[PDB]
Each structure stands twice: as structure tokens, then as C-alpha cells.
């Protein structure tokens, strides 16, 4: 086509999706990770995660308002990844990298798994 | 913070949101523009448009599944803008620029209004 493109559009959309999340506006699911709960938008989760894409395209699970993650999943690891989904920013630290990588593997977030593998290999 | 950022994340999220829209997955509103209907996600509309942000933060309108636009709104103009919302790409042409600009003004999409004003001024 002969379209023009607004460079910052995708980033501005994501910034507004994060603002809606922070204000709990039109959030439609709560992700339970052991004792912790995280409110989010199903569409954003599906757009970032192979696991959530599978869950919310399921004819029964698409209608659930609560999703309970595997008890082995670390809440801080999940929190860091949920923030990454809504911002493109990953708070990767020596103290959380193992939890972040295991959570990204479970959530099927290949690019996060990739940078975790690379950061781990550099320290060995 | 000490975060790392994945450059393509925002663009990949938007591409997946557009794929969900095309497959009518978790769409939660229909926008009626005279004889035409457009299915979309409220969160994406709010993230792109001052008008939709106002409508869906309203305590009554947030719960509506159908929104009827002003009868003066051109369906093709709306279609071009809805595509822009989900892709960052604006199909701006001599034959549609007036309709696109009027629709962007109504929807409160300042950057689109700006490029329409500039393209119009260049042709006078």
C-alpha cells in the first residue's frame, strides 16, 4: 500500500494500556500466583505470552475471570514479566534472573528466555 | 531503574492485537457508523482516541456492547482510522483526506489531525 506510519504509535498504545492497568480500568482477569493476585487485560496477556494465547483462545477458559498459575511459579518473577508485557522494560537482576527465566519459559515468552540464557552464559 | 528494553515489543503487541481483531477474538464492542459495523477491543480504542477514552471511562457507557457514532461520520474514514489504531499505518489519499481528518477530529486523534492539516496545506 501507499500508507504513512506514525513511528511512536505502538509505544503510545502500550503506555496507555499500562495506564489503564495501573488504574484497574477494563481489566478482565486476575492471575493468581500462590498468595499473590495480579489484575490484567486478557488481550495484552495473549499478545505477549504463548501460554495466555492458548488459555484465552480455549472455548471454556476464554470466559474465566480467574486463572491460577502452577504453584512452582514465583510471584516476583511473574510481576517482573507482567510489567515487561505492559512496558517493553525487563527488570533483570542477578537475584531474580533464575525466577524470571523459569517464569518466561512457562509463559512461553521466547525473547525473554533468550536474553536470560545470554545473561546467565556471560556470568559462567 | 536498571531495566533492559526489547525494541520490537510494542510493535509485536500491536501486531497480535490486530490478529485478534481480524479473527474476532475477545472483541467486546461494535462501533456503528451509519449502515456499517466495526468490531473492536475497547482498550485499544481508548488507547488511541480521546473520544473512546472518555466513553469507556464513563460509569454507564463502559458497559455498553454497541456505540453509535454521529451520523455525519464517514464509514470509510472510520475504517481507515480503526486500521491505523491497530497497525500505526494510515491510508491517507487525496480522495479520503477530508473524511479522515473530520473523523480524526471527532475521535480526538491529534497526530492524525496534524498530518492531515500538513498534507492539505501542501496541496493549496
Amino acid at each position: 500500500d501507499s500508507c504513512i506510519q506514525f513511528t511512536r504509535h505502538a509505544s503510545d498504545v502500550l503506555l496507555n494500556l499500562n495506564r489503564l492497568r495501573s488504574r484497574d480500568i477494563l481489566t478482565d482477569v486476575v492471575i493468581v500466583v500462590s498468595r499473590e493476585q495480579f489484575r490484567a487485560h486478557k488481550t495484552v496477556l495473549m499478545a505477549c505470552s504463548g501460554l495466555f494465547y492458548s488459555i484465552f483462545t480455549d472455548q471454556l477458559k476464554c470466559n474465566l475471570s480467574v486463572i491460577n498459575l502452577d504453584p512452582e511459579i514465583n510471584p516476583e518473577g511473574f510481576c517482573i514479566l507482567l510489567d515487561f508485557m505492559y512496558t517493553s522494560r525487563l527488570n533483570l537482576r542477578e537475584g531474580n534472573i533464575m525466577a524470571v527465566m523459569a517464569t518466561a519459559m512457562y509463559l512461553q515468552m521466547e525473547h525473554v528466555v533468550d536474553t536470560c540464557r545470554k545473561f546467565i552464559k556471560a556470568s559462567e | 531503574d536498571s531495566c533492559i528494553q526489547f525494541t520490537r515489543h510494542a510493535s509485536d503487541v500491536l501486531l497480535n492485537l490486530n490478529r485478534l481483531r481480524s479473527r474476532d477474538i475477545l472483541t467486546d464492542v461494535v462501533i456503528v457508523v451509519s449502515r456499517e459495523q466495526f468490531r473492536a477491543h475497547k482498550t485499544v480504542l481508548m488507547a488511541c482516541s480521546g473520544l473512546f477514552y472518555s466513553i469507556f471511562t464513563d460509569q454507564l457507557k463502559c458497559n455498553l456492547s454497541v456505540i453509535n457514532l454521529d451520523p455525519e461520520i464517514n464509514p470509510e474514514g472510520f475504517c481507515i482510522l480503526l486500521d491505523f489504531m491497530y497497525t500505526s499505518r494510515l491510508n491517507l489519499r487525496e480522495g479520503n483526506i477530508m473524511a479522515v481528518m473530520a473523523t480524526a477530529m471527532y475521535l480526538q486523534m491529534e497526530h492524525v489531525v496534524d498530518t492531515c492539516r500538513k498534507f492539505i496545506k501542501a496541496s493549496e
Binding site: C3, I4, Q5, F6, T7 | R89, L90, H111, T115
Partner: peptide, 4 residues
């Protein structure tokens, strides 16, 4: 705005 750019030519993509």
C-alpha cells in the same frame, strides 16, 4: 510520520 514516515514512509514505512
Amino acid at each position: 510520520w514516515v514512509i514505512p
